[PDB]
Amino acid sequence: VSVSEIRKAQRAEGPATILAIGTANPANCVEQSTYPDFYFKITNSEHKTELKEKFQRMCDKSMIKRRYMYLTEEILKENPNVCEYMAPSLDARQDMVVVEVPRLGKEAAVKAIKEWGQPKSKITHLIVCTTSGVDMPGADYQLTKLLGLRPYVKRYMMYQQGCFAGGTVLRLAKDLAENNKGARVLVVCSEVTAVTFRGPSDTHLDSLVGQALFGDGAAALIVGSDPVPEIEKPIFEMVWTAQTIAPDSEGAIDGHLREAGLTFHLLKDVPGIVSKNITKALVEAFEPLGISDYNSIFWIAQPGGPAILDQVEQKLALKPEKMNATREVLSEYGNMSSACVLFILDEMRKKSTQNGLKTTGEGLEWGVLFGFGPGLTIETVVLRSVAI
Amino acid sequence: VSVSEIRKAQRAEGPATILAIGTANPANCVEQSTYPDFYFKITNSEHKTELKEKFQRMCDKSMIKRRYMYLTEEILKENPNVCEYMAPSLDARQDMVVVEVPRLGKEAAVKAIKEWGQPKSKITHLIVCTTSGVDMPGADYQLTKLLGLRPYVKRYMMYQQGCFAGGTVLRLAKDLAENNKGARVLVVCSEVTAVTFRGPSDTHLDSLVGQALFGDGAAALIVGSDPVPEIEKPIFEMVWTAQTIAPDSEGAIDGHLREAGLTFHLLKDVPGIVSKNITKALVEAFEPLGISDYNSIFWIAQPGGPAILDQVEQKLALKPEKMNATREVLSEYGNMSSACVLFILDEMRKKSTQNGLKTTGEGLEWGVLFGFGPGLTIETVVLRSVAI
Amino acid sequence: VSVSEIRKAQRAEGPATILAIGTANPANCVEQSTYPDFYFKITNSEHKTELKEKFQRMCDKSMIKRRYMYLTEEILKENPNVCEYMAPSLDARQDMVVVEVPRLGKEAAVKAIKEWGQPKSKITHLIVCTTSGVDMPGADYQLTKLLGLRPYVKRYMMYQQGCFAGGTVLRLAKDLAENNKGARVLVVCSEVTAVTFRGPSDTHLDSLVGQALFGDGAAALIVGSDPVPEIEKPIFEMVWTAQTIAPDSEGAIDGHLREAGLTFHLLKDVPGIVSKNITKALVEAFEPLGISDYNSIFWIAQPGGPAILDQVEQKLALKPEKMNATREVLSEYGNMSSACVLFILDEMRKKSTQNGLKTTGEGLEWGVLFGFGPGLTIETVVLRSVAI
Amino acid sequence: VSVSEIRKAQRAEGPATILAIGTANPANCVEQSTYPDFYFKITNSEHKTELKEKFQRMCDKSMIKRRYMYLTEEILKENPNVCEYMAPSLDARQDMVVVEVPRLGKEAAVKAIKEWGQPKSKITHLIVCTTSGVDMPGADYQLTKLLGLRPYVKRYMMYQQGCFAGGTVLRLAKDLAENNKGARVLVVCSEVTAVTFRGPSDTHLDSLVGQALFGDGAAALIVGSDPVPEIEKPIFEMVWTAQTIAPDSEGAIDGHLREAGLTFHLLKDVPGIVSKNITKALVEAFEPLGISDYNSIFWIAQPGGPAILDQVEQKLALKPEKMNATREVLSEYGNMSSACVLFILDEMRKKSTQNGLKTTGEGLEWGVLFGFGPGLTIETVVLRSVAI
Known part of the structure; x- marks a missing residue:
């Protein structure tokens, strides 16, 4: 057996190409204009006037009109540990995101696959990326099962990546698609702020900044080389x-x-x-x-x-x-x-x-x-x- | 600008090849034959006679002569929450592994890099893999710093993967090396049981089995396509x-x-x-x-x-x-x-x-x-x- | 009779395209570094020391290595009226350029026509352009005769145009080619300094500058819309x-x-x-x-x-x-x-x-x-x- | 004189290699499906119905579609001694095979030498094998003369070998080629059933089996060690x-x-x-x-x-x-x-x-x-x- 014959026949030809993009956000839409009031009340810090004024400035300067958050008043009210600035609460937060990250990734992915229009059984690789929560088997495994991909789909579970990793999944997908003939990579980035949400602290103003900027959402792509002309749409x-x-x-x-x-x-x-x-x-x-x-x-x-x-x-x-x-x-x-x-x-x-x-x-x-x-x-x- | 000329000029030719391998383990070598005594003593479960016997059976049938462990008696007596079956201890555990995973990986990398023989400035890609702890920037960043790799080395931080990910990093490295002319990938897997070590419990024998089997180690590789003959050694x-x-x-x-x-x-x-x-x-x-x-x-x-x-x-x-x-x-x-x-x-x-x-x-x-x-x-x- | 059907059937489709270019110059190649000597001698102005220096400056700063000139020493010594600054000489000059402009253009045309590859019977339009001499029938007619173009080739004789008319013949050719299905335009620019060459005068330095800069040359093009692919070459x-x-x-x-x-x-x-x-x-x-x-x-x-x-x-x-x-x-x-x-x-x-x-x-x-x-x-x- | 220097310089280096194969069969193609009729008639045993039925089974079970035989109806009709089951006929049979074996070996050999493409004067050894007929000088001598080999070719005349001797000539040729530097061995196996063909006997059913299985043919090889790269073709x-x-x-x-x-x-x-x-x-x-x-x-x-x-x-x-x-x-x-x-x-x-x-x-x-x-x-x- 010739390893060069195999290598030549195993690899794709042209540039890795984005063929479909789907997005999804949790239902709760939180307006930035009223967030400081909501935030300071639900974290019981209404008495921290000076701090709240700082937060109001931060929100106003953010250039953000609204955000979608999985965290609602009802959920926050059942988790006082989460509303404090620093209380043991990882288990509760995990329980939320181990389920929500894949749940949200699925709505994004289904939309992406819908746009692509090809059988989901043709997806050969899956990249999953989150900075929220970690588990074993990971959110890639949950997404394979929730979406019905083939069990031999090739998975790449990117956890605790943080904010540069939209660029990272593209970088990764490029090499996957380009080196494997036929490969169609489903890329899913799903982020839920339930793990970073916490009460304000006037000595932790950087943490406060996070509370005004970060929002939840999931986006999915279909990436592959050598798209089928007039069938797939680069x-x-x-x-x-x-x-x-x-x-x-x-x-x-x-x-x-x-x-x-x-x-x-x-x-x-x-x-x-x-x-x-x-x-x-x-x-x-x-x-x-x-x-x-x-x-x-x-x-x-x-x-x-x-x-x-x-x-x-x-x-x-x-x-x-x-x-x-x-x-x-x-x-x-x-x-x-x-x-x-x-x-x-x-x-x-x-x-x-x-x-x-x-x-x-x-x-x-x-x-x-x-x-x-x-x-x-x-x-x-x-x-x-x-x-x- | 022709993308096909760029694509053909950008990719490597032959099969991804392992060019060097290096391993490292913590200094503390822990004999299995007497592991039950040490283990049941340090976790205060000596009174648990039957359960001790079961562990002895487990250790006897494990076919493991010994393991290297970051955890020492000194470290364990300083961390009782870690010695119980289920106490709050992730913070103490993170403090340990966020430092030890990159340290141990560095050891392994250095060896692999010495064998390879080429300047570490030629390492273009770095895969880091672990199942113990997470942090941001991750262990890939720490390793880049620790080894003095180029700031522009392309990183892939594989966290919370589990026991199949020796296979995973190889499948990842193969595409990195093969799609990229001149790429040399430094692949580092480093596992420290500090995050899983816990006390015995008779209703959780699966947990017990793990305390009988898992050990610490790092191994690093250099992977690249188109090796320079008589210079590099496949x-x-x-x-x-x-x-x-x-x-x-x-x-x-x-x-x-x-x-x-x-x-x-x-x-x-x-x-x-x-x-x-x-x-x-x-x-x-x-x-x-x-x-x-x-x-x-x-x-x-x-x-x-x-x-x-x-x-x-x-x-x-x-x-x-x-x-x-x-x-x-x-x-x-x-x-x-x-x-x-x-x-x-x-x-x-x-x-x-x-x-x-x-x-x-x-x-x-x-x-x-x-x-x-x-x-x-x-x-x-x-x-x-x-x-x- | 429908004029709109005729109009739509009469016009070409795409952009006017240059399909071939050929150039020609007189055999006499005149070095600029020693041009002042030659020039001041043939015009009997050697005694004009200062003015000679100025000309040397002009020639040095002209950034011209050489020029091709129809005028030779032999021709100049035979025509003293032409060698003085301002003597009656248009008849002698016309005799020269009325013949040399079409001759030189023919040379250029032949080259362009050989490159084009198509039978010269397919040339439908002819643009001739010069700034040296005029005559009736003009140089367009002489060129038609000289090249054996069809008697019904549509001619455009652009006389006494000056140095922007390289641009002019292209703007003309573009409309000829684009409004006429199947049209192939032979565009010929031919300039001979025989009509402007004159002796130096210290009160007319602008005139002198011209004797330092102008040179003889012809260039011809084939212009046409809707090129026959793989036959004609845009x-x-x-x-x-x-x-x-x-x-x-x-x-x-x-x-x-x-x-x-x-x-x-x-x-x-x-x-x-x-x-x-x-x-x-x-x-x-x-x-x-x-x-x-x-x-x-x-x-x-x-x-x-x-x-x-x-x-x-x-x-x-x-x-x-x-x-x-x-x-x-x-x-x-x-x-x-x-x-x-x-x-x-x-x-x-x-x-x-x-x-x-x-x-x-x-x-x-x-x-x-x-x-x-x-x-x-x-x-x-x-x-x-x-x-x- | 050093016998070791001589031995070292006399021997070849690499494995004995087959470099050309030619085959040849007599012209008469005899179909197995009609053989029992033909056989029983020409041996005048048409009245032996039971026996002929036995032969028909044998032919049908043989898995042989046809065979080439030197023996034709004309030749068999001039040799009634040959058509009997047991009549004096060796001299007639000899006369046939002493000529046919080398005649047939030559067509096979010429094809082999043709494929090899090297001068027949480079053949240093000759192995001839038959199980049909014997004579002095043997069929090796006849083949040397018929093919034009050199008279000092080294000959190995393998007679009355029988059916394992394709393996025997290869075994022999291996040692010849491998122990002599430069040696090129022409190997010819040529078999003609004219010596074993005989009439049926119901008390000699094994002999009858032979009549249904054996056919004529000749195959030749060129065997040698250290083939010349891109000249000779292993x-x-x-x-x-x-x-x-x-x-x-x-x-x-x-x-x-x-x-x-x-x-x-x-x-x-x-x-x-x-x-x-x-x-x-x-x-x-x-x-x-x-x-x-x-x-x-x-x-x-x-x-x-x-x-x-x-x-x-x-x-x-x-x-x-x-x-x-x-x-x-x-x-x-x-x-x-x-x-x-x-x-x-x-x-x-x-x-x-x-x-x-x-x-x-x-x-x-x-x-x-x-x-x-x-x-x-x-x-x-x-x-x-x-x-x-």
Whole structure:
């Protein structure tokens, strides 16, 4: 037996391609304008006037209009441990997300598979990503069973990833789809803030920031190489990827899973770091492609907060429209962690065709997607849009 | 810009190849014959006479001579919550493993890297895998820092995976190496039982079994396609992989991360399920290669316990020597979860070279590697040995 | 009879396309470094020491290595009226150019026609352009006769046009090819300095400058819409044209045909006017295409002198390589008036193909061609390159 | 003089290799379906109804479709002594085969030498084998003269060998080629049933069996060690040989050359003996090679009769395809004695490449050839196939 004959016949040919995108959010829509009142009451911190005023500023500055949360008043009222700033509550939080993450991922995935239109039995690989809760067998196993995938589907369970991992699942899916002939990868990012939600502390203002920014949601993709013409419908193509750790960012975003759930720490100037290091990432990605005009490409950026977005824009002299799709998702859903970047892809291609532009990438050919999160990590994915 | 030219220029040519293997264990070597005494004493369960006998039986039949453990008597007497069966202790456990997993992995990596011979600046991708603890940034980031890897090394943090993930990291590495010209993947599996160690309970004998079998270890590999001849030295080649979930195995191996640490549950007959489904896994992998004599390939089997190996051996009529390398690892180190299977590859190539056999796969050409774990999941990796 | 059916059946479909280019020059190659000696000697102005120095400066800064000239020493010594600054000589000059313009054009045409590959009986339209001499029947008729074109070829005799008319014949050809199904236009620009060559005079330095810059050349093209694939071979496509007169340029470039031949006058600052008005010409042409990065298109510029190119380059911050093809033509042939810009297209497509670039437009998609000349007139032609 | 220096320089290096195979049969093709009628008429035994019915069964059970025979109706009609069951006829039979054996061997040999493509003057050794007729000088001498070999060719005249001697010539050729540097051995097996053909006798049913099974043919090989790369074309390599006498088989196949020609006696159960003793031969040959799966090697077996073939198959659980090439030669040519096994080699490698398998041995690496005949003798030759 010839291992080269086998290798040649085992591998796919063309670029890994996004063929379907579905999203899903929990039912409870929480308005940002009334959140400080709701938050401070349900965490019984109504007497912390100064702190609440700080939170009100934070919410107002967030550029977030609303968020969807699995956590409701009824559920919060049955879990006083969760409403405290730091009480033993991991078991209760786990019990919530081990079920909700896959539950939410399934609605997103079913929509994705529906759009794709091909038999779910053709899905050969599955990537599942969450930063909320962990279990064995994991949420990949629960998703295989809930959706009816084949039991030999090849699974990649990405846990406790945090906010750069929309970029990470794309990076992963690229190699899966491109190295295996026939492979169709179902990618699901599902994030539920039930593990990070906690009461305010005036000595933990970074944790408070998290309470104003993070929201719940799940997005799913179908990725594969060599799409069947006029059967499958390419949306975006992946061409090149990178991942790096910004210099002088130790501790920028830390997260520790403890008996009191998932804590969140912000120990540097994330928007500063991100914007100081973004040009380097862009030249690494686009110089080999001969492009240096960063307004000539379409943009997708992980909206940790609005500040990141404004400083990147300011820094590069991006026209304001570049970040539109990113800012529309931040406005209607808040920072959905790893899934955010997939919602933005969906928003972008839908406005693009609804507005009758020539490509899925706002009428432009080449585009870039960035994931930002713990490390401080910068994930880059280079994309090419599709006609119509 | 032509994406097909970029794609063809971006990918590697030949089979993903294991180019180096290194292992490491904690200094504390724990004899199994007297393990019951040590264990029942440190967990204050000496009065539990019958249960002690059962444990002695378990240890006697485990076919494990010893294990290396991060946990010491000193560490255990300092952490009573950890010595009881079910006390709040995840914080103390995290503090331990968030540090020890990367430390132990580093040890392993250094060895692998010294063997490889090439500058660690040529490591393009890093896979880190563990089932003990989680944190953000993860152990992949800690390892990058600890080893002085390039900040732009592409990371894959596989957390809370379980005992089949030795198979998982290989199937991941194969696609990383094969789709990327020049890629060199540093693959590190590191397991520390500090998160699962707990006191005995007579109504939870499955839990007890785990305290008899699991041990600490790290193993690291260098994986790459298109090795530089006479410079780099191929050990094994990966040719085909698969992952499947066994029918009728719901709940066979569960593990939940809770406030009391990682619990372990065994709800079916794992040895029975594995041996009942191993034949299907084998024809799936070898029929396309035209091989049906399972005594004619070299074997690496995740050794969850000896009965999995015994019943598989009995089922297929494998000659007794087939599982030699597998049993040697079990004997000297116990079940090191995800790393076990990597320690086995090392043992087998070392013996084969040491004893001047014709190939690294015990003088045989084709081989199989299996990972068994939660789902019930079976990971299969088809390998080809290398001459000498 | 339906005129709309006739109209729809009469017109072509796609963009006017350049299908072949050929050039020709007189055999006499005249080195610029020693041009002052030759020139001052043949015009008997050796005693004019200072003026000679000025000419040497002019020649040194012209960035012209050499020019091809119909005029020889033999021809000049036979025509003293032609060697003085202002003597009655138009008859002697006409006798020269009425014959040499069609002769030289024929040379160019033959080459273009050989490249095209199709029978010259398929040439439906002929554009002839020159700034040296006039006659009746014109040079278009002579060329028809000389090449054995069909007697019913539709002719356009463009006489006394000046240095922007390389742009003019393209804008004319575009409408001829596009409005006429099956039309193939033979476009011939042929300039001979025999009509402008004259002796030096210290009160007429603008005249002197011309004797330093102008050179002889012909270039021919085949232009047609709806090329027969794999038969005919598109080089460039024309997409949009414009012609405008620069404000504040009255008298910038005048030329009068008199009894002493064609005189040349330069009354303003041509390099200044061009560079001051080039940006308006560019947004007019490219804003509707959405392109504002002028380094991202290929460039062809009429090289009246090097300072036009230098000040345009400086004005827009064009990278130095943009004007490479333009400067190569200036260097090897000087300012060949109306033909210059056609020689440049040839140079650029030849280099691009020779060097295996992705397109005939130096690997770029869109391009611009400019003609500068009397009025002050600016001709603009927007081009699209062809893959390979 | 150093005998060791000489010995070292006289011997070849690598395994004796088959480099060309040619076959040849007499023109008269005799169909088995009509043979009993033809046979019983020409031997004037048409009145022996019961006997003829026995013969019809024998032919039908033979699995032989046709045979080529030198003996024709015309020749048989000029030799009534030959058509009787036992009449003086050796001189007439000799006169036929002393001429026909070499005549037939030459056509086979010329084809072999043609395939080899090297000058016949490079043939250094000649093995000739027949079980039909004997003379002095023998058929080796006649073949040297008929083919133009050099007079110093080294000759090995194997006479009255009988049916195991295809294996015997290979065994012999191996030592000739391997011990002499440069040696190229021409091996010719040529068998003509003119010496054994005789009338039926109802008291000599074994002799009758011979009349239904044996056919005429000649096969030739070119055997040598150290083939010239990309000049000579290895087909099969010989690695090990054995010859043995089965226990309790005295008289199984006897043959005596008498005044009435060559008689044939079958005094035991040949298929029983052969199949009872074949496993022992196989372990002697393949245990040292570490192979015990007799379906993993390619097969060539001397088809004394179909019964031998079925009992060997049955006994070892050979898949039915193993004996395909052996059964195709038995079908189209019958039992050609010593040459049969060489025809099978030819059939095997030709179907193998015509069917696009990876090796000359049906895509397998290792193979075995067995010769069976008087003694009862078992000849074993271990072979290795060649890529493509």
